[PDB]
């Protein structure tokens, strides 16, 4: 049929896998996990996490995205058995969507609020919100006496706009009672999923072309954003904040747990946008040097951002004697809490706020449109007579996922999002990360990896990373699998609980893409007609390799496989 | 590919089409109705609107389906324009049974009510209900004095339990705060949907057979029932609120357009079961006298339900001297209600129910698979591809179904589920059966028509069938949609109102189905290239017919085929 619609050029693809890994700083805590994991002492545990966990796994899935030349969906031509996890990493990345587009409309509402000369957040005097009038008083506007506040105060401008005027969160008691969407988050959305279609239509060329202009604006804006801290007073001992090292407060399973799923989180691997774009890329690359940049772009990313964030924070506690510790609000939308009201005490608000909206709308487009054109490729290449009506599927992807997002956009959307996000993100990617590193691993084998990578590359990995893809990521993944099964705790809001029954529903969403490996590996093994022994060879041997099933020759029913590094 | 998979009999499609048609009972408050025009005169109208809406448009849709051989997806072949309509009757028919199928599991419930020994509305000691200790006092056990109680009295034992066991209205205000579905009617849906899937999946002679068991005991119950209501001394007065014939009370504008529905709701001329029937059936079949004895049969079972509801009603006002006018609960289990009582007055009230609920549990199976099998073929012949897979089809056809009835199977769901009948029923059906009339009437031409019968029957149908078809059909059925839309009323429960925005989300729900003929006529036009009287001859000319479009042979264009008669 037609051939893969090759990039423009290299730059192309690094600037779209760079932007696709810059979410850090939209929804994720990366500063606030950074202070609770042994103060300071956190760089050292921080990197290594890092290394062991995205290099092996960031260099697996582009050599197999590469090699294999298709998407997520069928990149397990080599072992049906495991093509199931192809499914189920497209589907949960739709679930990601579900909610992230929604945060992506919330910031574009922030743009609507940036536009005007006085912004909602600097007055509180009724400016685009509804306060409860409950203690209407300016954080800095209206000077008072210092108290503790019940060591809680949720009543400052800017988190009142946050919940009263783009949450709505007032109308709404809970998750047993949703209420009907809004009208601004809905067509926020809507414009949102318009760009989606209008840019994802046409293939990865317009893809590339988007990502080439919004991924380059955060770095000038972390920059600016920078040097705008560095020259107020207030952020030296910001920075004191961001790095207070104590070796003595590393406990024990308490800083290791909380980093593990933060970098897992945020450099992306394993959720299937990285074989998706590997299979658009030529087959003659260096994906060692480029995941090693990859890596090294997203660390630097992560520390800018979480050094802006502790210097906005630091700022902050200088304008009011108050502790920023347990004042600020830890949630969600703690971006869009916390730092457009130091955006309030600078100079030229509106230009800044422009900026920052703008940077964070394009670091959101960048991830939505990675997640969304895994999907497409994924149920493309699994399915021919979906791949030649690419504008079709694109418009109905985006259509059912707006469907499907009003549960996430209206009044009290925020707590099912958090609920999606969490449970879904957390336990299905973990699982399927964990079945793509056992099944790469185990049932293919790291000698055949290597051997197809000296072949499409100018050298074979070495003994360490075979073993970093045999035996560290697998009992790595599983163990935090297990951390995270075991120690779980019970969902809930900043002061709202869960109710009993949401966290069965959670578990079940999340399972529902679990189970998706068990149902298929049953399918293959009923659809193949042939002894017990013919049917496993032919779920553990690659398609092309079928022949070999009559001759029966199998190595993985050999001991040398189980044990060739 | 494969032929037509032809009935065993005529006996089978008989059977199944008489089946299709014993809904009046089920929902349908048919003496209601009826008592309400004109009293007792309304034998006359209700035959006479009965005829000239049935017969006419009954025989065009038997003709259309046996001459086609299709499904009403294609069966527009000879008219692609109207074409889309054959989409709406399909969906608008899964539309009826979202809620259609919860009715359903709703008598399955008072199935389980049956098997006990002691029946739940006898006793209002919390037996199976949970009421609300306001007045917990029986009808006929506890003798009090006689007050009219406000003129509205739902505590009665019977509608308690059905408030609060069956339905959980008690835990719902209204439709903007809903709950969670009823684990009893979950597993009762989960149940008929599972039933529907065993019956449908195999084809037409599963269907057949099991309308050849279910259709033959509601005869029988009905005429046990009619026995025992004669039997009973309070009947007789009932037959006097049955016919109270009173000629002076036909107003203007007030006795036609309530029969004028019922009627159309009734026969279900239209709604695409019956071209789906006659796909199957022989080429070689008098249209004519089988359209004749199922409007009959219809109109003999309406009449015998109406004698038989009334006179259960003469005999609960001869139980209780409180009048049975304002006392009863004119919804949608007035059958569930009412009825159950009276059982609970007559001896061994055990057999009767049970017998009383196979039979309704008989006719909304038999409606419920009639529907959904117009929509499998329709979607079948639409889409060949899906022709084959027909099991893996109709499962995914029903698993969409359970999960999208979920909103009228919860605590509110009464109140969505009368919205999305009433809107959706009325307004779809009645502009696509429009649509239909218009596109064979005056765009095909009846004169092709009636030589198609003629060539596939041993008569013509004379200058009455035709007139009937032309010029009384298409003006009767835009009188009775101009009268739905000005003389529309705010849908409201008998005690519950429903808020503003009730009645534009049922508005905007009734209108998806009728906006689906201009967009297709829209998709249409741009599918095909050339000058505009080419594309409005294809568009209008038969597809074999394609080939007199470029000799400009269309009779269309003609004056004599509009005033053809």
């Not at 599983?478 to 578990?507: C, E, H, M, Q, R």
Request: hydrophobic share 50%.
């Amino acid at each position: 049929a037609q051939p893969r619609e090759t990039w423009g050029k290299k730059i192309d693809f690094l600037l779209s896998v760079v932007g696709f890994a810059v979410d850090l700083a939209n929804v994720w805590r990366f500063p606030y996990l950074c202070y609770k994991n042994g103060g300071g002492a956190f760089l050292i545990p921080y990197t290594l996490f890092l290394i062991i966990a995205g290099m092996p796994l960031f260099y697996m899935e582009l050599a197999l995205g590469q090699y294999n030349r298709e998407g997520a969906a069928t990149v397990w031509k080599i072992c049906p058995f495991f093509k199931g996890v192809g499914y189920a990493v497209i589907l949960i990345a739709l679930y990601v969507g579900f909610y992230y587009n929604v945060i992506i409309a919330w910031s574009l509402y922030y743009l609507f609020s940036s536009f005007t000369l006085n912004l909602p957040w600097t007055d509180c005097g009724h400016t685009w919100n509804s306060p409860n009038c409950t203690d209407p008083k300016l954080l800095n506007g209206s000077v008072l006496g210092n108290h503790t506040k019940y060591s809680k105060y949720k009543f400052t401008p800017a988190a009142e706009f946050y919940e009263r005027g783009v949450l709505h969160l007032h109308e709404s008691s809970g998750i047993h009672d949703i209420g009907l969407p809004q009208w601004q988050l809905l067509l926020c959305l809507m414009v949102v999923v318009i760009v989606l279609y209008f840019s994802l239509w046409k293939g990865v060329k317009t893809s590339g072309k988007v990502v080439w202009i919004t991924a380059t604006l955060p770095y000038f804006v972390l920059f600016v954003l920078l040097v705008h801290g560095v020259t107020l007073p207030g952020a030296s001992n910001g920075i004191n904040a961001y790095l207070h090292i104590d070796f003595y407060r590393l406990k024990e399973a308490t800083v290791w747990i909380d980093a593990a799923t933060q970098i897992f989180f945020s450099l992306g691997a394993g959720f299937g946008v990285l074989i998706a774009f590997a299979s658009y890329n030529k087959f003659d690359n260096n994906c060692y040097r480029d995941a090693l940049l990859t890596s090294s772009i997203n660390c630097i990313t992560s520390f800018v951002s979480g050094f802006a964030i502790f210097s906005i924070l630091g700022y902050m506690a200088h304008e009011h004697k108050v502790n920023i510790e347990d004042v600020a609000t830890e949630g969600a939308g703690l971006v869009f809490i916390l730092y457009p009201e130091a955006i309030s005490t600078l100079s030229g608000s509106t230009f800044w706020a422009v900026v920052f909206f703008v940077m964070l709308l394009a670091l959101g487009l960048d991830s939505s449109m990675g997640g969304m054109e895994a999907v497409i490729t994924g149920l493309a290449d699994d399915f021919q007579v979906l791949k030649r009506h690419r504008k079709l599927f694109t418009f109905g992807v985006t259509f059912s996922t707006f469907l499907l997002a009003l549960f996430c956009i209206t009044k009290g959307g925020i707590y099912v999002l958090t609920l999606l996000d969490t449970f879904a993100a957390g336990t299905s990617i973990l699982f399927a990360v964990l079945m793509e590193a056992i099944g790469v691993s185990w049932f293919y084998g790291v000698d055949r990896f290597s051997n197809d990578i000296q072949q499409m590359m100018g050298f074979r990995p070495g003994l360490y990373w075979r073993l970093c893809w045999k035996f560290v990521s697998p009992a790595f993944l599983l163990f935090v699998v297990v951390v995270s099964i075991i120690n779980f705790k019970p969902l809930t809001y900043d002061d709202y609980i869960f109710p009993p029954w949401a966290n069965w529903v959670g578990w079940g969403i999340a399972l529902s893409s679990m189970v998706l490996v068990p149902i298929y590996v049953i399918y293959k093994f009923l659809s193949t007609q042939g002894s017990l022994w013919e049917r496993l060879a032919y779920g553990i041997t690659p398609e092309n390799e079928h022949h070999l099933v009559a001759q029966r020759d199998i190595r993985q029913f050999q001991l040398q496989h189980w044990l060739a590094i």
